[PDB]
RNA sequence: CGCAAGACGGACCAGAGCGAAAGCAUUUGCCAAGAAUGUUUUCAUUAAUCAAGAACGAAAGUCGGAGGUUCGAAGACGAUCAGAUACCGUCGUAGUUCCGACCAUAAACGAUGCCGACCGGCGAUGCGGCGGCGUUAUUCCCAUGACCCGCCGGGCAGCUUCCGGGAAACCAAAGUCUUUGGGUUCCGGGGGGAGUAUGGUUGCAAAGCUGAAACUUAAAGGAAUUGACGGAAGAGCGAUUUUUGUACACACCGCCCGU
């Protein structure tokens, strides 16, 4: 019984895809199958923003951002709840979740 | 059953595109005086930007 | 380079960009082209210069990606190298 | 769909199909008479030429081959035949 | 599809329905034959001769004008190569691949392509033996191939 | 702040491309090869699939040389545990890297042989060609690049459909099958014994290919449904009509493997 038409990966018209290492557990997982996440955040948190803006020597100094690319295997993605199981009909929907308010 | 005094369809001037005028002409209706030909939009950009 | 009685005198040694600038320049649906040259100045200083550029999406573009073909990338890289060579 | 006259396709239908998939095959190419401004000779050139055509009298490059069609040199005029 | 490739292309030529020479063409059969003879003496294969005639002299199809094909005209005149041009090109390509491969021992793709090319050469040689164009002792050997073409 | 060695080419990198398949990603140069598109060029049946026979063939493994950064089978320890000879942590030998000879095996998978014909829509995408308002760069001009709107031909795929199939899951092929015949190659015949013994053959070895019988058994197995469990979050042939997984249905107090 096939669960998915694409076999859970994004490989089409090619034979081999080089593996990467899970950020959490360092497992080898093919790059097309891995769960990718691009994280752009602030170096300083919300309270730290107000605590730092007063102690800075510059005027309206913009705090730098952190850019990180994260790769997860299926087990770590499910365990960390960045990915959840869906219904048989809801599996097909591949629209990203509505994070934009 | 509210009825206005005049019809909203009644217009002294109705604007049409040249293609609509040609379609009317093919049906021997190119003699209408209410028609006014408007310049079509120069740029053909009617699709949502894919992304 | 030299000390002159409580006055250290420095000289140019290099140039670079900040980490967040480079991280924010790289995006997912475009092409990146990089080049490097080794050029000697008239007074003996040998330099290695690196250049980076990205393809730009058009104002009225409907296609999601903006990819340059390989020959276009090679032409752009050669244009980078010759300009960087002729200015040093 | 379920009603189409295969014997009598419209003239625009047959110019939209592939040249081999028409009812009767017909090429998309043609021959043309070309004249350069320098020299008065008229040269017959195939539209999808694969060689550089030189004027016999005055050694002028009439056209340059490309992937699909041959592009005429600037200032050269052409007219289709028949 | 291709004999030795998975590709299934459809690109080719489509001759017109009419077989009559167009009115604008002023050339006679004899003039076309003389042009063909001059081009052959210059050292051109029939394919190149046809390409030149199509591009420059407005000769769409020589068989429509002169009533005969280029190779038959050459054979009647006697200016025809000993072995057919397509087999010559196949053997020349095999020689080029074999010359490349001797300096590059680790190029397995060259070996695969050489096997394919030699298979095509054997097919064509057997066909030409069947038609008696080649004597029934002609053999393609790698050592002899350089001298053959 | 420098030096040295070895291994790997991040982000860009995608249900994108190339290759017969294994497989393929820093720049530049050289060498040979190739698909697709264009063609009013040439030959004229030269073609398709294929016993015999051949080239290639991940990783691991074997034999000689060169290097040995990282990781790391075996091994020595420290923990955990009723017990661990495992999972976890510290080291660490072959190996992991390159050259030359072997080995020919993978869930080597689309679990789907190749060639040809016909049979619904839709929107994208990669390559080539053709046509056409209009924005930009090459200071001017064509023309060529970047966008925009279409058409054709191959290619990787996607959505939809009472085309029709099928036990169903699902499939525009897995359709055009009791209305059964387009060509052709390999290959299966209830579950075990068993891919085992023996013979032959190949290899340095490990092992590869070919390959039984005696005997034993009434089922094993596929798809789907309702429950029960979990140290998881009008429509269908028909049973039937919170999500999810199941080899459980005497329903986890289950079932079940090896000494
Ligand atoms: Mg594989
Ligand atoms: Mg995935
Ligand atoms: Mg074949
Ligand atoms: Mg072609
Ligand atoms: Mg392919
Ligand atoms: Mg890189
Ligand atoms: Mg065999
Ligand atoms: Mg190996
Ligand atoms: Mg090895
Ligand atoms: Mg060794
Ligand atoms: Mg350990
Ligand atoms: Mg270690
Ligand atoms: Mg096998
Ligand atoms: Mg697979
Ligand atoms: Mg199989
Ligand atoms: Mg397409
Ligand atoms: Mg392509
Ligand atoms: Mg295009
Ligand atoms: Mg049958
Ligand atoms: Mg049996
Ligand atoms: Mg039995
Ligand atoms: Mg009922
Ligand atoms: Mg019913
Ligand atoms: Mg499970
Ligand atoms: Mg399952
Ligand atoms: Mg159940
Ligand atoms: Zn993980």
Are C31 and C73 within 8 A, CB to CB? Answer: yes
E96 and E140 both lie in a single domain: yes
Task: DSSP letter for E21, please.
Answer: P
Closest chain E residue by Cα to residue D33: E58
Q: How far is CA A46 from the centre of its chain?
A: 22
Looking at the structure, do residues E73 and E86 belong to the same domain, yes or no? no
- Name the DSSP letter for residue A19: E
CA neighbor of D62 nearest in space, from E56, E58, E61, E24: E56
Indicate yes or no: CB of C18 within 8 angstroms of CB of A64.
Answer: yes
Q: Is A41 at the interface with chain C, CB within 8 A?
A: no
Query: Domain containing E127: what range?
Result: 81-149
Residues in chain B: 51
Number of Cα atoms under 13 Å in the Cβ half of residue A60: 0
Binding residues of D for Zn(2+): 36, 39, 55, 58
User: In which order are the strands placed within the sheet that holds D53-54?
Assistant: D53-54, D61-64, D71-72
Return the closest-CA partner of residue A17 out of A29, A26, A3. Answer: A29
Distance CA(E56)–CA(D34), nearest Å, equals 11
Beta strands, E only, chain B = 14-16, 35-37
Chain D neighbors (3+ CB pairs < 8 Å): E
Beta bridge partners of D74: none
**Would you list the domain boundaries of chain A?**
1-101
For β-strands B14-16 and B35-37, DSSP reports them as parallel
Question: Within this chain, do residues E93 and E103 fall inside the same structural domain, yes or no?
Answer: yes
**Which helix (H) or strand (E) is B20 found in, with range?**
helix B18-26
Judge if E105 and E71 occupy the same domain. no
Helical residues (DSSP H) of C1-88, grouped into ranges: 19-25, 70-86
In a domain, E109, yes or no: yes
Distance F205 C1' – A45 CA (angstroms): 64
Helix residue ranges, H only, chain E: 29-42, 46-56, 62-65, 70-77, 85-103, 108-130, 142-148
Whole-angstrom distance, CA of residue D82 vs CA of residue C14: 71
Q: Are strands A65-72 and B14-16 parallel, antiparallel or unpaired?
A: unpaired
**Which residues on adjacent β-strands are paired with residue A28?**
A21
Taking the CA of residue E25 and the nearest CA in chain D, the distance in Å comes to 10
Indicate if E58 and E75 belong to the same structural domain: yes
Last residue of one domain, picked from the residues E80, E102, E124: E80
Place of tokens 């095959």: D25
Contacts 24+ apart (CB under 8 A), C56-63: C56/C30, C57/C30, C60/B43, C60/B45, C61/B49, C62/B45, C62/B47, C62/B48, C62/B49, C62/B50, C63/B50
Are E62 and E123 in the same domain? no
The verdict on residue E100 lying in a domain is yes
DSSP D70: P
Q: What is the number of domains present in chain E?
A: 2
Rounded Cα gap, residues C23 and A66, in angstroms: 8
Same domain assignment for residues E76 and E125: no
Q: Is D in contact with E (3 or more beta carbon pairs below 8 Å)?
A: yes
CB A17 within 8 A of CB A65: no
Closest Cα in chain C, distance from residue A40 (Å): 9
Residue E68, token pair as written in the block: 């005969």
Domain shared by E97 and E70, yes or no: no
Please enumerate in sequence order all residues whose Cβ is within 8 A of that of C13, keeping only pairs 6 or more positions apart, or say none. Answer: none
Same domain? For E72 and E91 the reply is no
φ, ψ for residue A44, nearest 5 deg: -100, 140
Domain assignment present for E48: yes
Q: Evaluate whether A64 touches C20 at the Cβ level (below 8 Å).
A: yes
A65 touches chain C (CB under 8 A): yes
**A69 close to A95: Cβ distance less than 8 angstroms:** no
Phi, psi of A13 (to 5 degrees): 65, 25
Q: A66 with A42: CB under 8 angstroms? A: yes
Distance (angstroms) between ligand 7 centre and the Cα of E111 equals: 20
Q: How far is the CA of E96 from the C1' of F20 (A)?
A: 22
Cα–Cα dist E92/E113, whole Å: 14
Secondary element (H or E) of residue C83: helix C70-86
């Amino acid at each position: 019984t096939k669960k998915r038409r694409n076999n859970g990966r994004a490989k089409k018209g090619r034979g081999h895809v080089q593996p990467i290492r899970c950020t959490n557990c360092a497992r080898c997982v093919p790059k097309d199958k891995a769960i990718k996440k691009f994280v752009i955040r602030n170096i300083v948190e919300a309270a730290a923003v107000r605590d730092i803006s007063e102690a800075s020597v510059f005027d309206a100094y913009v705090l730098p951002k952190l850019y990180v690319k994260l790769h997860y295997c299926v087990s770590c993605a499910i365990h960390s709840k960045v990915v959840r199981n869906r219904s048989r009909e809801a599996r097909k929907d591949r629209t990203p979740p509505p994070r934009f308010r | 059953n509210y009825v206005p005094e005049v019809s909203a369809l009644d217009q002294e001037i109705i604007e049409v595109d040249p293609d609509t005028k040609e379609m009317l002409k093919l049906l021997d209706f190119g003699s209408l005086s209410n028609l006014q030909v408007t310049q079509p939009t120069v740029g053909m950009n009617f699709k949502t930007p894919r992304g | 380079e030299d000390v002159q009685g409580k006055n250290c005198l420095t000289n140019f040694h290099g140039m670079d960009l900040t980490r967040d600038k480079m991280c924010s320049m790289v995006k997912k649906w475009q092409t990146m082209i990089e080049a490097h040259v080794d050029v000697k100045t008239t007074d003996g200083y040998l330099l290695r210069l690196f250049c980076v550029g990205f393809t730009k999406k058009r104002n009225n573009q409907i296609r999601k990606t903006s990819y340059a073909q390989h020959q276009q990338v090679r032409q752009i890289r050669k244009k980078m190298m010759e300009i960087m060579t002729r200015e040093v | 769909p379920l009603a189409k006259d295969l014997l009598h396709p419209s003239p625009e239908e047959e110019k939209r199909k592939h040249k081999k998939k028409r009812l009767v095959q017909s090429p998309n190419s043609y021959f043309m008479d070309v004249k350069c401004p320098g020299c008065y000779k008229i040269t017959t050139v195939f539209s999808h030429a694969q060689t550089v055509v030189l004027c016999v009298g005055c050694s002028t490059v009439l056209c340059q081959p490309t992937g699909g069609k041959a592009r005429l040199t600037e200032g050269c005029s052409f007219r289709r035949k028949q | 599809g291709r004999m030795h490739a998975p590709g299934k292309g459809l690109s080719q030529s489509a001759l017109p329905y009419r077989r009559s020479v167009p009115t604008w063409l002023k050339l006679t059969s004899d003039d076309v034959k003389e042009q063909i003879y001059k081009l052959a003496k210059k050292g051109l294969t029939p394919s190149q001769i046809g390409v030149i005639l199509r591009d420059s002299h407005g000769v769409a199809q020589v068989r429509f004008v002169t009533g005969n094909k280029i190779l038959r005209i050459l054979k009647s005149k006697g200016l025809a190569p000993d072995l057919p041009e397509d087999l010559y090109h196949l053997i020349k390509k095999a020689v080029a691949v074999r010359k490349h491969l001797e300096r590059n021992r680790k190029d397995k793709d060259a070996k695969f392509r050489l096997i394919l090319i030699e298979s095509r050469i054997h097919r064509l040689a057997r066909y030409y033996k069947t038609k008696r164009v080649l004597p029934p002792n002609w053999k393609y050997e790698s050592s002899t191939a350089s001298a053959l073409v």
